[PDB]
């Protein structure tokens, strides 16, 4: 695979990286308390266009909104906060030298503990944002306007009753599955027999009901991702733990006698891969949900795909040489 490279000049450990929706911009965040934005030229280069302090803690993620909401970023922190940022044309004030044209429009503060992950929602819901934290809660916020990004109503507190490490929204634009969010847990206790939990917005009760819990994931979880839906009658879910896992979640059709309750799933494991010989620290999907990537303590990003028989295998190993 052909590589270009960039010196990132973060003054401590980088914790995350994320692309814009077009792959024309990227964001990165660090223990130096900064976020940086880097933009891809009409010559094939990349340049650092903003590099500013975001928070008081170590920054644990960075994420973009969909561009029908313009140019908006979110970041989560060890100081127990999350923050929302807008890119503005022409505001940048020499009266306050060395501030960014990426302005903080709000700070969310309601988590009792470090905010471990943050994700914007599937755009068909609205301008919505989820965060999770080590108080064992996921929190969901809504902006009632797309311009007044200072104002965000906290609509849901979702109780995992185990610490939260990561979150994934379900990427179903199809109006035949209700809104869904999956949650992973860093909990090292032997008492909690499952470390992944799944919630469904149920119109009949108007709150995120706990539909399922993965009783085969006994082991701590570091990252979690639903696969983008090529029309499938079933969902696919990747998990990062002591090994890589790929689950299927196929909705059980309700009989016309099971009203008011959430849905339920015919659930399988399609794959479980030890091959990192080490823990797994991210899981992210290609745009069509046909290829998974995952990293570990083996210094390899490993690529995974279905063959024509839906037998999932490793297909590539991207690894450093140290020269």
């Amino acid at each position: 695979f052909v590589a270009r490279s960039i010196a990132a000049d973060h003054k401590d450990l980088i914790h995350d990286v994320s692309f814009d929706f077009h792959g024309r911009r990227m964001a990165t965040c660090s223990s130096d308390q900064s976020v940086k934005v880097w933009d891809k030229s009409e010559s094939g280069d990349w340049h650092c266009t903003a590099s500013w302090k975001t928070h008081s803690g170590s920054v644990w993620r960075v994420t973009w909104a969909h561009p029908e909401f313009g140019q908006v970023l979110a970041s989560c922190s060890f100081d127990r906060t999350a923050a929302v940022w807008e890119e503005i044309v022409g505001e940048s004030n020499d009266k306050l030298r060395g501030q960014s044209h990426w302005v903080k429009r709000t700070t969310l503060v309601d988590s009792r503990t470090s905010v471990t992950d943050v994700k914007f929602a599937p755009k068909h819901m609205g301008l919505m944002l989820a965060t999770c934290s080590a108080d064992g809660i996921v929190r969901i916020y809504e902006a009632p306007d797309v311009m007044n990004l200072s104002q965000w109503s906290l609509q849901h507190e979702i109780s995992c009753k185990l610490s939260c490490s990561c979150i994934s929204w379900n990427p179903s634009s199809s109006r035949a599955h209700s809104p869904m969010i999956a949650v992973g847990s860093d909990d090292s206790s032997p008492n909690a027999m499952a470390k992944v939990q799944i919630f469904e917005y149920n119109e009949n009760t108007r709150k995120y009901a706990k539909a399922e819990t993965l009783m085969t994931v006994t082991d701590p979880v570091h990252d979690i991702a639903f696969a983008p839906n090529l029309g499938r009658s079933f969902h696919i879910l990747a998990i990062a733990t002591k090994d890589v896992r790929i689950f299927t979640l196929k909705p059980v059709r309700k009989e016309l006698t099971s009203s008011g309750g959430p849905t339920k799933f015919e659930i399988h494991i399609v794959a479980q891969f030890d091959n990192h010989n080490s823990q797994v620290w991210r899981v992210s999907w290609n745009i069509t949900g046909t290829v998974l990537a995952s990293s570990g303590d083996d210094g390899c990003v490993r690529l995974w795909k279905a063959n024509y028989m839906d037998n999932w295998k490793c297909t590539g190993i991207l690894k450093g040489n140290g020269s």
Partner: protein
């Protein structure tokens, strides 16, 4: 089964995998990677390493500048193939699919020979080797395609199959014609050291009247051998080769070739050639002697030329359903059991076993680009031979390959347009694969975004049309280009966005005394009705389109309708009251008594909401000098119109 080797290992420079963890994310053709190391100086004088970000593009070939010729020409040929009729009878259609195959071969050839001249023109031997490597890949593609064409598309019958396989070797083992030029260009062709090697190689390619003409230069130079060289050359004219214009049976060819063999071996028993061992070897070769043919291995550059030689001199009536055994047995004898076969040998063997699915599998492992396998599998569904069987995810094997290839064209800045057509012929998953890519095309210009919108509007991708139009409306709102912002929110048909752009124009008016556009508000037409606030923007310009341009009772009832609506901003209600002063104090009563009460009802729900709070600051006084003057002129003019209205209205209840 599939993927039972090691998973393809990319090495990243500088990155120190030997303990260091990594983070990554996915873009349209590139994946990011970043390393978790930061070197906080244990006292050594060295520069501390910053962390590094890496941009890892998909490996697959689409950025090679010459191969863009191959991608556009094979899109023209692919669209020429997806426009063939299925009722075209199995003689017209088979001839037309053989043309489509030979069209695709012509593009591989016309990209390879361009790249060969570019490899010669390469002013650095590093770059010349990078082009020469891709020339060998295009050669391997046209070698495999020429075989797959003969076996699966033209489907050569017993007899003609050997003619097809001789020129299959000849069109690729071009070494012989170059060596022919060196030998023939010399002052004495029969005394170039390679002359006898070339005479043998022409016989190994079955080029027997060309071999006769080389043997004539020994006969012209050597009056001692010339008589025997002419017996050899005349045996090279009695060989029964099949002629396509000739009405014979295979058994006739067979029985004539059996006489020719019984006559060639006869000249070996009377020892006719034991005065020149080269001519004695040529007789054994022409008799199908598998030992003498293996003594010629340093004149047989590959095992499949050895196979075709062995068929020419040992089985001229070979059939497709015999052929596997000769292919394997020729690979066995050429490799000898101390060498393994290369990936090309595994593909060519599977083609001689006729396993199209093993051929497709090993081509998907030996060739870096889906381009080959996708176009070959598409053409073999046009022949109806395939895993047109459904896969576990609904789509078929032709579709599964086209989806990875179309996603590979969307991974490049230009080729995404071709990638749309390569998604439209994928019936189970093509549309949804397109709908996940199409919103992610970089919209640098409104003109580029029109091409993408047109593609979505043609295909009725209506929430993606809304998305792209709102991305364009938000490009325009962040740049304050209110005419593009309104026109794109009108194409999106989003009433909240149309209200939000109206809630720029109505402030932009108060921030100036005038709008930043007029023609855009006048030419709203039927699209004015996309919200209440856009209807108010259009109708307050329409009130301002009676003030230079028309009359008064039309304007007054419009002004009161604008005011009494939930749509007029209350920071402008003092203005809309001031705008009534030139209509109230007219000699003609223009507002009725009933309408004058609603104007006062609006002045009261403005004034009865001032707070009674005291004392700080001094500079505030000098618009309350003016506000009280506004309010008193309004009380006085509204009371004066009301009195004139009651007298005019109550007299029309009294005659």
């Amino acid at each position: 089964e599939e993927l039972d080797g090691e998973p393809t290992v990319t090495l990243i420079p500088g990155v120190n995998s030997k303990k260091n963890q990594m983070y990554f994310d996915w873009g349209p053709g590139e994946m990011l990677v970043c390393e978790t190391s930061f070197n906080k100086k244990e006292k050594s004088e060295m520069v501390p390493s910053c962390p590094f970000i890496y941009i890892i593009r998909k490996d697959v070939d689409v950025y090679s500048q010459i191969l863009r010729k191959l991608f556009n020409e094979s899109h023209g040929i692919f669209l020429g193939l997806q426009r063939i009729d299925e009722e075209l009878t199995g003689k017209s259609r088979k001839s037309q699919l053989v043309r489509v195959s030979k069209n695709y071969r012509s593009v591989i050839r016309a990209c390879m020979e361009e790249m060969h001249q570019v490899a010669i023109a390469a002013k650095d031997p590093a770059n010349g080797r990078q082009f020469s490597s891709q020339v060998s890949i295009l050669s391997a593609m046209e070698l495999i395609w020429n075989l797959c064409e003969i076996l699966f598309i033209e489907v050569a019958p017993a007899g003609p199959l050997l003619l097809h396989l001789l020129d299959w070797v000849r069109l690729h083992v071009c070494e012989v014609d170059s060596l022919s030029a060196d030998v023939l260009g010399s002052e004495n062709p029969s005394k170039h050291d390679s002359f006898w090697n070339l005479v043998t190689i022409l016989v190994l390619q079955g080029r027997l009247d060309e071999a006769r003409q080389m043997l004539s230069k020994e006969a012209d130079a050597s009056p001692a051998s010339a008589g025997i060289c002419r017996i050899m050359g005349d045996l090279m004219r009695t060989m029964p080769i099949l002629s396509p214009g000739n009405t014979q049976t295979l058994t006739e060819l067979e029985l004539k070739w059996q006489h020719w063999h019984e006559e060639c071996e006869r000249y070996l028993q009377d020892s006719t050639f034991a005065t020149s061992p080269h001519l004695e070897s040529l007789l054994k070769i022409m008799l199908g002697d598998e030992a003498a043919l293996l003594e010629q291995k340093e004149l047989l550059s590959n095992w499949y030329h050895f196979l075709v030689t062995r068929l020419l001199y040992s089985n001229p009536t070979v059939k497709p359903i015999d052929l596997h055994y000769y292919a394997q047995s020729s690979l066995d004898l050429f490799l000898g059991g101390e060498s393994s076969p290369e990936p090309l040998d595994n593909i060519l063997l599977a083609a001689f076993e006729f396993d199209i699915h093993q051929v497709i599998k090993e081509c998907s492992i030996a060739l870096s680009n889906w381009w080959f396998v996708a176009h070959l599998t598409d053409l073999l569904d046009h022949c109806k031979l395939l895993q047109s069987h459904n896969l576990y995810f609904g789509s078929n094997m032709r579709e599964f390959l086209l989806l990875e290839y179309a996603s590979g064209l969307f991974a490049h800045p230009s080729l995404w347009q071709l990638g749309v057509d390569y998604f439209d012929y994928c019936p189970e998953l093509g549309r949804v694969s397109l709908e996940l890519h199409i919103e992610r095309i970089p919209l640098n210009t409104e003109q580029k975004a029109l091409k993408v919108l047109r593609i979505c509007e043609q295909r009725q991708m209506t929430e993606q049309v809304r998305s792209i139009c709102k991305i364009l409306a938000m490009k325009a709102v962040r740049n304050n280009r209110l005419g593009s912002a309104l026109s794109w929110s009108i194409r999106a048909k989003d009433a909240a966005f149309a209200t939000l752009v109206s809630d720029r124009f109505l402030r932009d008016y108060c921030e100036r005394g005038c709008f930043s556009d007029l023609d855009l508000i006048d030419n709203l037409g039927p699209a004015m009705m996309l919200s209440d606030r856009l209807t108010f923007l259009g109708k307050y310009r329409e009130f301002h389109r009676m003030y230079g341009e028309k009359r008064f009772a039309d304007a007054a009832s419009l002004l009161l309708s604008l005011m009494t609506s939930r749509i007029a901003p209350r920071s402008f209600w003092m203005t809309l009251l001031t705008d009534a002063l030139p209509l109230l104090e007219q000699k003609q009563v223009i507002f009725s008594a009933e309408q004058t009460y609603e104007l006062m009802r609006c002045l009261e729900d403005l004034t009865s909401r001032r707070p009674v709070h005291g004392e700080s600051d001094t500079e505030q006084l000098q618009d309350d000098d003016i506000e009280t003057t506004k309010v008193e002129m309004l009380r006085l003019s509204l009371a004066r119109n009301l009195a004139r209205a009651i007298i005019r209205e109550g007299s029309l209840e009294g005659s």
